[PDB]
């Protein structure tokens, strides 16, 4: 009997361990599904999604003690209790002074899971959490310093409720979480939480992936976006594919300690249109383009480093100011311009500026369709946000066509039967 039908763990030369197909997979086929080994709902989604299964529901039942955890019913409340009990009493005593980061909360859950279930779980048929790479020999002082900060926050918020292995074991575990952890996003790509999917973490990266990972609650699903032939390695993308090769590889080296050698990284075919420049009387020289690219990459890094504390109004002003400055060299289709429009659209949605959000979406969609792969979650989500804006602004004709473009991608990535597709189809009917 096969551990996972038509698939196998294997050794990928120069890429450690990986996943290979044994039988052919065609576009849209489900390779495998993997239940979360551990997961945690993001703080911002408390009250809107079930803390246990991540279901989006109205009328979730709150925990009577803390009144901070919300569930579908008592069954989801009972399932989550071994994890929620580590935080319940702490959330009552300490107010909003109880603030461990998402990584610290997820790691506390892995520690609790390892204690009760030391054997391999149904989520570890190919790769177990204990086998995860950590790359501790490669970590920079900054990443080593964040691991130590996370360990101290783990003792501070969980010492009374969890028994810890030694410090070295905690350094290994937080390093494994950084290298193998996932984030779960909804149908609009909004962040829902963090999770460990050991069998999904076995797949190596490519910027030309042959699979896409989607979520059905906290169940990860892996679907083919091209033919996967017997003997082919199964590759997913670890990062956002919008960016030029250099940006992608600096991100990959920083978080995963490797340089990608996929076809896109080798040919660099899409870089020219990704860094589109405007046709001026001049036009811009290499040095002026390099200066604006360096500037944009720094704004993106700064936006990333300050995300947690900056208000949506401060986030909007930076976007508008950066877009205005870059527009002297860059075309609107340039990825750095798209970065600011996407963030700025995000703020328009937050402040219920539906018309402002739509004007941004209208400019992002065509360049997104060109820059991303043919089957892209980013492209499907953008068509979906566009469609929802149009429907809300009474443009049923434009909304329906935009929702159908989303559905066409989602049928391949999420499967034809996904609840997201059923929800979108219901929105078309009403
Ligand atoms: N395209 C690629 N080239 C080289 N190493 C890669 C890679 N994709 C992923 N990896 C490696 O795999 C790590 C993530 S976890 C993925 C499976 C890993 N090969 C293992 O043996 O456990 C990365 O940190 C990096 O070591
Ligand atoms: Zn639930
Ligand atoms: Zn509680
Ligand atoms: Zn690549």
Author numbering: 3 to 432
What does the paper say about this structure?
We have determined two complex structures of SmyD2 bound either to the cofactor product AdoHcy or to a potent methyltransferase inhibitor sinefungin. The two structures are remarkably similar to each other in terms of cofactor binding. Despite that the structures of SmyD2–SFG and SmyD2–AdoHcy are highly superimposable with RMSD of 0.36 Å over 400 residues, close examination reveals that the first two helices of the CTD (αH and αI) adopt different conformations. In agreement with the conformational changes, the flexible nature of the αH and αI helices is also indicated by their higher than average isotropic temperature factors of 41.9 Å2 for SmyD2–AdoHcy and 39.5 Å2 for SmyD2–SFG. The overall crystal packing is effectively identical in the SmyD2–AdoHcy and SmyD2–sinefungin complexes, except at the packing interfaces that involve αH and αI. Based on these analyses, we propose a model of SmyD2 activation by Hsp90, in which the Hsp90 MEEVD motif could compete with the β8–β9 hairpin for binding to the SmyD2 CTD, displacing the CTD from the substrate binding site and causing a conformational change in the CTD. This model is in agreement with the conformational flexibility of the CTD as revealed by the structural differences between SmyD2–AdoHcy and SmyD2–SFG.
Members of the SET and MYND domain containing (SmyD) family of proteins possess histone lysine methyltransferase capacity and have been shown to be involved in the transcriptional control of cell differentiation and cell proliferation. Interest in SmyD2 has grown significantly because of recent reports indicating that SmyD2 repress transcriptional p53 activity by lysine methylation (Lys370), exerting an oncogenic and drug resistance action through inhibition of p53-mediated cell death pathways. Immediately C-terminal to the post-SET domain, the polypeptide forms a large domain of about 150 residues that constitutes the C-terminal lobe (residues 280–432).
